[PDB]
């Protein structure tokens, strides 16, 4: 099993971009998807200030140069987790995109939770699912806020359960506890569709690459 | 299972300390990936603070030169009866045409704001753009 | 390679300047009885009431003329440290884009 490990699980970690996630997007694409459009300055969160290019007539603009690097890192992490057969859970309480996110999760063979988050999904999983339940290895927040404009409880619960989190953070969101924050617009349907497309493509490509590498290793 | 003190360090530091301490038999699936490709900022909890006194946010207002022209255009000829099409990535409003002509005259002539404005208006009317003051 | 600064500077939304009393073209993308949800290229959509005149012509995909009043409706309320947003834009429905 040592050769298996070294050739399959350790090899992808020796390359900066093993899954070529950098070709899935560009600053032009993010701009065309309206990823740079934030909330008004009155709704700004302090910890989002380093990610803000500036305010245009009292409307915050998200610096897409930083969004590009953050998204590169987040997509790379997601692809690596999917390659390792980790359980990926998408979470979002925006009802405008519940159907889209559930469809995307079903399509890439991952899991979705767009509904009311009951107390104890993650911190009390053994009682609520069973003593042998396996929790997600990665959680992806398309929307980090709930419908009362407060953080999704799953952010703190995932931090408690030591589950890394990728997250789309708008100008009124708190990115402190998200492992891989991605500054961007989370309201426009174009931006959400782009995020779903990028994550789905990354996960499917990573799973296909894992299968191909397994097949090649078995053949040789 | 790992430490549930989400406000002490980060998931990475907690997991690493527990692993080296022998509490966790094996690293979790994400630990190696985090090692190879770490985030730009370590996800450490921090309590947001209200600013007081002279402290101010470092966020600047986005302004351009032509904004001045735009403003005064919008103050003289008003908002164009034509409708903006924000879906078109290369939409060109009447005000934007006025701005481009103003800048062209500025680089092909002197710098007198009123003279530039009147001359640009004359040029646009000559081209065939209606402009009701 | 176009930088983000250039794209922002030459963006139609940036060129529009203030959004008050600006005429825009929006597209209907959702119908709820007589509630028309219209996208006009901003961060948020606007919800308008179906006009009583030629109301049957307002359907999904229809292009309409709007007068923008606010790109996002927010307001700080007494005893609050942050603004409250309705996640919606304010606009007046004028008619159908011929």
């Amino acid at each position: 099993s040592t050769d298996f490990n070294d050739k399959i699980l350790n090899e992808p970690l020796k390359h900066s971009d093993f899954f070529n996630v950098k070709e899935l997007f560009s600053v032009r694409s993010l701009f065309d998807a309206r990823v740079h459009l934030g909330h008004k300055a009155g709704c700004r969160h302090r910890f989002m200030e380093p990610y803000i290019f500036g305010s245009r007539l009292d409307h915050d603009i998200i610096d897409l140069e930083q969004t590009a690097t953050h998204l590169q890192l987040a997509l790379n992490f997601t692809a690596h987790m999917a390659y390792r057969k980790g359980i990926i859970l998408f979470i979002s309480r925006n009802r405008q995109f519940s159907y889209l996110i559930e469809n995307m999760a079903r399509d890439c063979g991952e899991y979705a939770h767009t509904r009311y988050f009951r107390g104890g999904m993650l911190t009390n999983a053994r009682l609520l699912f069973g003593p042998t339940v396996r929790l997600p290895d990665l959680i992806i927040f398309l929307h980090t806020l709930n419908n009362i404009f407060e953080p999704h409880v799953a952010v703190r619960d995932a931090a408690k359960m030591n589950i890394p989190t990728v997250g789309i953070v708008d100008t009124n969101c708190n990115p402190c506890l998200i492992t891989y924050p991605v500054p961007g617009n989370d309201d426009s349907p174009l931006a959400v569709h782009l995020y779903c497309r990028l994550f789905q493509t990354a996960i499917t490509r990573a799973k296909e690459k894992r299968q191909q590498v397994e097949a090649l290793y078995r053949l040789q | 299972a790992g430490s549930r003190l989400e406000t002490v360090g980060s998931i990475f530091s907690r997991t690493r300390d527990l692993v080296r301490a022998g509490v966790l038999k094996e690293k979790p699936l994400w630990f190696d990936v985090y090692d190879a490709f770490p985030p730009l900022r370590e996800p450490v909890f921090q309590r947001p603070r209200v600013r007081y006194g002279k402290a101010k946010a470092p966020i600047q207002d986005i302004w351009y030169h032509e904004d001045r022209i735009r403003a005064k255009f919008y103050s003289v000829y008003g908002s164009g009866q034509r409708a903006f099409d924000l879906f078109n990535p290369n939409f060109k409003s009447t005000c934007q045409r006025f701005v481009e002509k103003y800048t062209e005259l500025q680089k092909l002539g002197e710098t007198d704001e009123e003279k530039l404005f009147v001359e640009t208006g004359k040029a646009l009317l000559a081209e065939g753009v209606i402009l009701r003051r | 390679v176009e930088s983000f600064a250039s794209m922002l500077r030459h963006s139609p939304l940036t060129q529009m300047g203030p959004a008050k009393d600006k005429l825009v073209i929006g597209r209907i993308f959702h119908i709820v009885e007589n509630d028309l949800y219209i996208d006009f290229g901003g961060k948020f959509h606007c919800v308008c009431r179906r006009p009583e005149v030629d109301g049957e012509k307002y359907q999904k995909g229809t292009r309409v003329r709007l007068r923008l009043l606010d790109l996002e409706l927010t307001s700080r309320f007494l005893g609050a440290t942050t603004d409250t947003t309705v996640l919606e834009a304010n606009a007046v429905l004028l008619g159908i884009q011929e």
Partner: peptide, 25 residues
């Protein structure tokens, strides 16, 4: 880069509203 924003006072700033007797004795 020449496309960066520049510092100025708000050019779209509407004049402050005045009462009907403003400037009158």
């Amino acid at each position: 880069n020449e496309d960066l924003p520049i510092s100025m006072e708000n050019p779209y700033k509407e004049p402050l509203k005045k009462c009907i007797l403003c400037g009158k004795h």
